[PDB]
Design a protein around this ligand. Sequence first.
Ligand code: A1ED0
Ligand code: A1ED0
Length: 147
Amino acid sequence: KLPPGWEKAMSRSSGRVYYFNHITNASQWERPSGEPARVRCSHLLVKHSQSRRPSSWRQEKITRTKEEALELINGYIQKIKSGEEDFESLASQFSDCSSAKARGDLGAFSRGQMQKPFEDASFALRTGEMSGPVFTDSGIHIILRTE
Ligand SMILES: OCc1cccc2[nH]ccc12
Ligand SMILES: OCc1cccc2[nH]ccc12
């Protein structure tokens, strides 16, 4: 029926059908369109107090809760989707990964290199697509597939 990971859902607020991907946590109104050895992705990471290393270039000791990190992630996604902010700008300013200095770009990678939830989401995105919140031991990620 639908591409890998996608399913139909019903909006509670509006009643209209939408589509949700349980691998990437993406959601959208439009029906999803249409695997490579390698993909190229950028990401924006928000760490929290239970991250494997609760420290980053932005903060020596990260104290925000997981719930607070998810709220920050949700807000970044909202501004990216409305066009108020670009993914690259938010990643450079607010990502708790040192890849912030390269606008979030991780370069190209294969399966078996990244943490599993990150890898699975990266390879389930189509080129140009963006994930919802993706949870790893490092924190919560927004992933943008660029190639
Ligand atoms: O690695 C330190 C550093 C140098 C230059 C730009 C940066 N952005 C985030 C960390 C960072
Ligand atoms: O493995 C997931 C991942 C990929 C690339 C950069 C990252 N930084 C923190 C986690 C992380």
